[PDB]
């Protein structure tokens, strides 16, 4: 279980302190290592701009380009570090470049594949929905907008959440379904932290916006329905009035309205309840590493906690001297990372769709 940083040309195995981060609430996973070398040696292989591939044991965790390298020395001590992110982080701070700003009739995957072409990032689409693949009747690009900003706007409109893969790709991820691991208070927990705040959760989210009237639909849509659009998503966890009104983000229909209103409700649900734990081993029970997007069964009954299943949201691996081997795993309810079509557990078409939704490994009819 050695952390090898395949830099440009050669391997680097031993390290003084390692910290890796991964999450599904972000588009990159950053790492930070510490290197101790005699004062005067050359650390060229670890330079800003080099192409790095982090490999824990025999498996690759991060891949991309090195960002920073700090060197300091005082009358007593001396410290050198090195940092870096994924290659998906190349889109975050780079402005999107395309010839014609407007896409007329394209889907989110096609728009993403057209926007992430010059850089090198490969887009991966995992959702098998029939409504998340609905094409945009028109999607323009604000000038001097980053690829991250544009794709995040589109993903928020669709309800999908974007994330960076472990191989450097872009991924439009799908939440897990099968409970794979168990975290209990008595066996394999060193520290737990259960925060449950209700300062953001409302009862009735409702989104309002403007209808579509550009071009073909302009000969059909009347004057009042252009301005009068609405959508609602109601929460049952807050018993007081507590409403919320959202001015929409783009041209909006009724079905699209409810989609974003639900997306907003589920994101608030995910952001409200948070579990945090510090387990002892980097590896899982089966043997692989700990990574986000995993459905675990929580059995913290000794502390009077009634949650049963949660979904991991953030995993950070540590190799400090005072710490040893630790991985701080954060958990959030699964119902916060779902698409508006699916739900947490009127015809033949509905029955077939339900069957092929319960069984995702099957091939849909499409």
């Amino acid at each position: 279980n050695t952390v090898t940083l395949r830099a440009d040309g050669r391997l680097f195995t031993g390290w003084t302190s390692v910290s890796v981060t991964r999450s599904i609430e972000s588009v990159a996973g950053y790492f930070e290592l510490g290197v101790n070398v005699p004062p005067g040696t050359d650390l060229s292989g670890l330079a800003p701009g080099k192409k790095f591939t982090l490999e824990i044991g025999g498996q690759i965790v991060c891949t991309g380009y090195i960002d920073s390298r700090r060197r300091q020395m005082t009358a007593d001590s001396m410290k050198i570090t090195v940092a870096g992110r994924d290659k998906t982080a190349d889109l975050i701070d780079c402005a999107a470049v395309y010839s014609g700003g407007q896409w007329k009739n394209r889907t989110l995957e096609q728009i993403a594949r057209d926007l992430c072409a010059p850089y090198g990032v490969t887009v991966r689409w995992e959702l098998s929905d029939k409504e998340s693949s609905a094409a945009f009747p028109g999607f323009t690009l604000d000038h001097s907008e980053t690829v991250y900003e544009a794709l995040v706007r589109a993903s928020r409109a669709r309800g999908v959440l974007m994330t960076s893969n472990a191989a450097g790709e872009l991924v439009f991820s799908r939440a897990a379904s099968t409970a794979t691991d168990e975290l209990v208070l008595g066996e394999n927990l060193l520290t737990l932290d259960f925060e449950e705040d209700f300062r953001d959760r409302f009862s009735e989210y409702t989104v309002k916006g403007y209808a579509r009237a550009n071009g073909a639909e302009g000969d059909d849509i009347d004057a009042k329905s252009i301005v009068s659009r609405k959508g609602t998503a109601t929460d049952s966890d807050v018993t007081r009035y507590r409403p919320m009104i959202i001015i929409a983000d783009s041209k909006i229909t009724a079905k699209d309205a409810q989609a974003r209103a639900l997306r907003e409700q589920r994101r608030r649900l995910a952001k409200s309840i948070t579990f945090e734990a510090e387990i002892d081993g980097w590896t899982r029970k089966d043997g692989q590493l700990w990574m986000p997007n995993l459905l675990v069964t929580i059995d913290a009954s000794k502390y009077a906690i009634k949650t049963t299943e949660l979904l991991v949201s953030k995993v950070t691996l540590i190799l400090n001297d005072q710490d040893g081997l630790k991985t701080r795993v954060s958990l959030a309810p699964r119902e916060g990372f779902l698409v508006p079509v699916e739900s947490d557990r009127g015809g033949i078409d509905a029955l077939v769709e339900d069957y092929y939704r319960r069984h995702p490994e099957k091939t849909p009819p499409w």
């Binding site: 981060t21 599904i24 609430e25 972000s26 588009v27 990159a28 996973g29 950053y30 992110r85 998906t88 982080a89 975050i92 991250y148 995040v152 993903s155 928020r156 959440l161 974007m162 994330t163 960076s164 994101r267 952001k271």
Partner: peptide
């Protein structure tokens, strides 16, 4: 820097706008 790194990394849930 706990939040100062979440900006340099992506945030699929927007912080503003």
């Amino acid at each position: 820097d706990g939040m100062g790194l979440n900006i340099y990394a992506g945030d699929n849930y927007i912080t503003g706008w």
